[PDB]
Design a protein around this ligand. Structure first.
Ligand SMILES: N#Cc1ccc2c(Oc3ccc(F)cc3OCCn3ccc(=O)[nH]c3=O)cc(F)cc2c1
Ligand SMILES: [Mg+2]
Lengths: 409, 548
């Protein structure tokens, strides 16, 4: 079929991003993969008259998978291709009991790409020690990772999905990039059999899915702030308590700490046990009660990007908050991971970022920009090691450490 | 040339350059004709009709005061209008990453750009005109058939042309390694000298078949090779001789050049320091301003002169052997490292320095990051690390550190100085320890301040301070509490600045006050620092605020 014409935003040139140095292993894997893809027509070699560039990486299984970082090209295309060929996002996907993610990227490789647009998909397999200038390719078909691909394949996807949709009107199906999110209220067994039914349906219609991941968004909510519960209280405990409540006053108006402040009126030792008075305990009760309820007047803005902050709690635990404006949390949570002689900090952080990004997709239909607690170069070095996703969120690296660490715990 | 041309566009919405041709002297026009007739004779240029509406300035310049002149064309106005190309090679291969070959040959091609044809439809945009004397006769029109010198596209196009030309020979000779770089090729092989020279002559003949000349005689360059500030020797690599000038006066320019040479030399000469000399360069003022050399800078420079006395060399890479990198601390926040496969031979060396309160372990980790990046770039792998730090030390650090860190495979090497945790704050308040409620305050205008404390034992103190800030008083309060307390002390501050600086647990800073605080913290047995909201009348904190 003839290709769908693809235009850029007026005034915007193509992407020109540097290629990250790679291990010899990864470079060889990419050379192999691209040799096969060139052999199948999916990509071709290009000349020096093509100035554009898009980074490439190698991730994983026991088989190497190639991952293109199309973020820049996305900002330079999809921003007008979320308008023109945009995909609507269902608000009922987050309400379902079970959501399974299917990989439907392999579809895009069947469909050709607009001839005048291919030059923007340019990527470079690097060489070690700048020995050779690098192997240069561009895509001839719809590339995985580009947001224009599922937008162009949208109608085909609708057409293939319509029969299954008709046979299953209570199942929600939402396509984000190369992934198909399928949610239902069915029992886990019935759910998995249904997902398999969709797998066989898609397969007998010419769509392979290399799954031969389960979420539960009905349990997902903005977690309530927890005040310490103690039998006896020392001066230090009451100080941390008053401090934390005072911090919480930035979110919940109505928080008072006077009755708790009068309890430490004299200059006492930090280990001195202080009994709670009437006004004090009543104040703590009222504060706990007002803290148990969710925040008032907090709504999602479709015109604003999502911001995800993460902080490390130690002992294999991380806590995160998703917001758009300060102290207006759209979605907080706490990602914990079992060590099992496996995990380190970067592994946990990466898996956390992926979990958060997936939740964000399921809820709002788009991904947040992360403020990551990690050195920039360290992350840029090792983030591809535990990356199992096909998309890549925006991120930046936080400078100053949080003193608010124990306030999210 | 039978070489296939590369299609070139002008930038969208732009047309060819129409620029004035300003008159020249008679001799210049004569020489221009003398050269252009010979260029036309070789088909590199061609006369054109009056139809061509574009033009480009032409100048004539003597070559090093010699017989033959040189034609110079300013394409800067055309370069603005031509499309962007693939970006040419940014960096160059580092000798430490090269591998020993029994034979290495340098082949430089002449007229490299003029030996490669230019896209036909684009040739009309490179049109230029030779002026006539007194404008009594029409000017001589010309245009390029090949890659013009100083044109935006010539380097990348020549690069790809060369690569495509080399592809067949490369295919028929998989056991020889060709490196491409600008006008040069560098051919290495493990073939015996006779076979190698045969293959070299074979390559020369190929390139000549594609219209590319290359040295006919015994190749003009022999080892050692002076290449990009390097000395490349058959079994070792080093840098070209560094010259540290002797001057009574030093400007910003001279210091910049000096720091340049020292940095450049630091890749193979172990121990080079540049912190004190570049600390003079903190002043972003004029490049001609004379900067007085401090005593520390003088000592540093002298030590560098001592290091650079006897020459040192680096070896080449062996894929079959392990890759080891070892790190040592130099004291002033400076770090140095050696990357090697063998005990007495370095592949290369280097340094790391933290610019812009910090601690030794964090710096060490940063260095490990730098070396990891460099290793990946040069050899395509990550090295095994040898580090002066205990496992319990580093584990203790990375466990309670707020950022996520990647700690690689490493073994402990007991070589002083060692990296350790000099002090460690208590996680819980100390029973049987005095509690200093501290506070400090200053005036933004007068810069008059005061810092003090109030303790649960009834002890109180207020010390006056001149020429200070709110922050520095907030630190001074804590310092005071540390000074007047026992080996175990509970400090309570309302300042999240001070709390932030201290909880980071630094062992060094560019602030003397913080250094004194660190000294006190090391001298103490147990120190618990707690924080409370200011002006909330919690009590204990209120009296100290009232005092100061
Ligand atoms: N001018 C110039 C020039 C000459 C040789 C170079 C070189 O050379 C090499 C070229 C191909 C190759 F396979 C391996 C090389 O170097 C391995 C190390 N080495 C080096 C020099 C020598 O005499 N012997 C030797 O063993 C690699 C390189 F990046 C740049 C070079 C630039
Ligand atoms: Mg105060």
């Amino acid at each position: 079929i003839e290709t769908v014409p693809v235009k850029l935003k007026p005034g915007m040139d193509g992407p020109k991003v540097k290629q990250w140095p790679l291990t010899e292993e990864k470079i060889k894997a990419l050379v192999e993969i691209c040799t096969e893809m060139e052999k199948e027509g999916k990509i071709s070699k290009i000349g020096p008259e093509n100035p554009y560039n898009t980074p490439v990486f190698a991730i994983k299984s026991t088989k190497w998978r190639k991952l293109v970082d199309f973020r820049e090209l996305n900002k330079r295309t999809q921003d007008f291709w979320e308008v023109q060929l945009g995909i609507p996002h269902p608000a009922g996907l987050k309400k379902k009991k079970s959501v399974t993610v299917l990989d439907v990227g392999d579809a895009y490789f069947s469909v050709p790409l607009d001839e005048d647009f291919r030059k923007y998909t340019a990527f470079t397999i690097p060489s070690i020690n700048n020995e050779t200038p690098g192997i240069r390719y561009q895509y001839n078909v719809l590339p995985q990772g580009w947001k224009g691909s599922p937008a162009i394949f949208q109608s085909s996807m609708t057409k293939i999905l319509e029969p299954f949709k008709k046979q299953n009107p209570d199942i929600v199906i939402y396509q984000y990039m190369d992934d198909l999110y399928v949610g239902s209220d069915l029992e886990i067994g019935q759910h998995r059999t249904k997902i398999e039914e969709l797998r066989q349906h898609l397969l007998r219609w010419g769509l392979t899915t290399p799954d031969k991941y389960e979420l539960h968004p009905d349990k997902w909510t903005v977690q309530p702030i927890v005040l310490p519960e103690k039998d006896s209280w020392t001066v230090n405990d009451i100080q941390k308590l008053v401090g934390k409540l005072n911090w919480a006053s930035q979110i919940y108006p109505g928080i008072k700490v006077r009755q708790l402040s009068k309890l430490l009126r004299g200059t006492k030792a930090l280990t001195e046990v202080i009994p709670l008075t009437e006004e004090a305990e009543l104040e703590l009760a009222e504060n706990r009660e007002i803290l148990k309820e969710p925040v008032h007047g907090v709504y999602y803005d479709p015109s604003k990007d999502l911001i995800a902050e993460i902080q490390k709690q130690g002992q294999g635990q991380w806590t995160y908050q998703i917001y758009q404006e300060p102290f207006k949390n759209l979605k907080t949570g706490k990602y914990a991971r079992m060590r099992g002689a496996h995990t380190n900090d970067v592994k946990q952080l990466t898996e956390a970022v992926q979990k958060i990004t997936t939740e964000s997709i399921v809820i709002w239909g788009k991904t947040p920009k992360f403020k990551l607690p990690i050195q920039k170069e360290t992350w840029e070095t090792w983030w591809t090691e535990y990356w199992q996703a096909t998309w890549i969120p925006e991120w930046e690296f936080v400078n100053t450490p949080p003193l608010v660490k124990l306030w999210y715990q | 040339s039978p070489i296939e041309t590369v299609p070139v566009k002008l930038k969208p919405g732009m047309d060819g350059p129409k620029v004035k041709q300003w008159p020249l002297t008679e001799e210049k026009i004569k020489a221009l004709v003398e050269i252009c007739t010979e260029m036309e004779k070789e088909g590199k240029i061609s006369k054109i009709g009056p139809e061509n509406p574009y033009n480009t300035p032409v100048f004539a310049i003597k070559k090093k005061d010699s017989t033959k002149w040189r034609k110079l064309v300013d394409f800067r106005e055309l370069n603005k209008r031509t499309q962007d190309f693939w970006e040419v090679q940014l960096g160059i291969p580092h000798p430490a990453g090269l591998k020993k070959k029994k034979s290495v040959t340098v082949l430089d091609v002449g007229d490299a750009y003029f030996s490669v044809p230019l896209d036909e439809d684009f040739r009309k945009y490179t049109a230029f005109t030779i002026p006539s004397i007194n404008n009594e006769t029409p000017g001589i029109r010309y245009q390029y058939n090949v890659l013009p010198q100083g044109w935006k596209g010539s380097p990348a196009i020549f690069q790809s042309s060369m690569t495509k030309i080399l592809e067949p020979f490369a295919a028929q000779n998989p056991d020889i390694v060709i490196y491409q770089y600008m006008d040069d090729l560098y051919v290495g092989s493990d073939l015996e000298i006779g076979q190698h020279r045969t293959k070299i002559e074979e390559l020369r003949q190929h390139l000549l078949r594609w219209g590319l000349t290359t040295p006919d005689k015994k190749h003009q360059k022999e080892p050692p090779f002076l290449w990009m500030g390097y000395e490349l020797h058959p079994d070792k690599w080093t840098v070209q001789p560094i010259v540290l000038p002797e001057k009574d006066s030093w400007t910003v320019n001279d210091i910049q050049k000096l720091v340049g040479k020292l940095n450049w030399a630091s890749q193979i000469y172990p121990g080079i320091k540049v912190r004190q000399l570049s600390k003079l360069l903190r002043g972003t003022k004029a490049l001609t301003e004379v900067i007085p050399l401090t005593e520390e800078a003088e000592l540093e420079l002298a030590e560098n002169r001592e290091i650079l006395k006897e020459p040192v060399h680096g070896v080449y890479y062996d894929p079959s052997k392990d890759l080891i990198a070892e790190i040592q601390k130099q004291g002033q926040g400076q770090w140095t490292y050696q990357i090697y496969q063998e005990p007495f031979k370095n592949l290369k060396t280097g340094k790391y320095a933290r610019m812009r309160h910090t601690n030794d372990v964090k710096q060490l980790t940063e260095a490990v990051q730098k070396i990891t990046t460099e290793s990946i770039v040069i050899w395509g792998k990550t090295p095994k690390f040898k580090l002066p730090i205990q496992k319990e030390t580093w584990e203790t650090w990375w466990t309670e550190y707020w950022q996520a860190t990647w700690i690689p495979e490493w073994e402990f090497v007991n070589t002083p100085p060692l990296v350790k945790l000099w002090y460690q704050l208590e996680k819980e308040p100390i029973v049987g320890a005095e509690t200093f409620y501290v506070d400090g305050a200053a005036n933004r205008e007068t810069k008059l301040g005061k810092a003090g404390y109030v303790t649960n034992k009834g002890r109180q103190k207020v010390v006056p301070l001149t020429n200070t800030t709110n922050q520095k008083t907030e630190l001074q309060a804590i310092y005071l509490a540390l000074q007047d307390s026992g080996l175990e002390v509970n400090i309570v501050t309302d300042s999240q600045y001070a709390l932030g600086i201290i909880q980071a647990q630094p062992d060094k800073s560019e602030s003397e006050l913080v250094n004194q605080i660190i000294e006190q913290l090391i001298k103490k047995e147990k120190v618990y620092l707690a924080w409370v909201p200011a002006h909330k009348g919690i009590g204990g904190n209120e009296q100290v605020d009232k005092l100061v």
